[PDB]
Amino acid sequence: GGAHKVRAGGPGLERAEAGVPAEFSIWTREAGAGGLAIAVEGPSKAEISFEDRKDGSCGVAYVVQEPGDYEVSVKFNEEHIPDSPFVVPVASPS
Amino acid sequence: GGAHKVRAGGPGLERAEAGVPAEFSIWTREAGAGGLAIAVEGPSKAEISFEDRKDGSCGVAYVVQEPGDYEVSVKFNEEHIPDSPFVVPVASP
């Protein structure tokens, strides 16, 4: 286990725009060893990558192609972390 | 089940090549109503699409980036059809 020791936060968990990279961070320092899985589900395909953060958290960026409501899940050892899944409204680009 | 009335078959359930569209067909005619889910899981990102085939089956094409073994899932109403997941060895071109 250890999912309860993981926290995720950032703009990409609150709102996104179609085609614009949406970014958030995952606090992993306390969780120990395990599989950290990020998933995006919704009306269009998503591309997800892991990134560096200065603060030592694990950075995530994703891009979706169409507006709509998407669900972003973050699981650790196949267990939802607190507040996952996140419902993220994705708007047409401004 | 209902997923037990679904069948899938084609080169893309047997073997694939990185960068090369891998194709198979799903016979859906007698599962009735429901959600047909195809998934590709493995060492790189997969692009997946559907085509309505002229023979009346549901066509599927996928492309993956890297060689390795991939699991191709075909589920009907969250249940694996017979022989799913398909383990597909993927060669480099």
């Binding site: - | 109503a33 959600g35 047909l36 998934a39 060492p43 997969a46 997946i48 996928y62």
Partner: peptide, 13 residues
């Protein structure tokens, strides 16, 4: 990393 892509369509007679 392990990657998964999935696509779900609704079948309706």
């Amino acid at each position: 990393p392990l990657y998964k892509s999935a696509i779900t369509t609704t079948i309706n007679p």
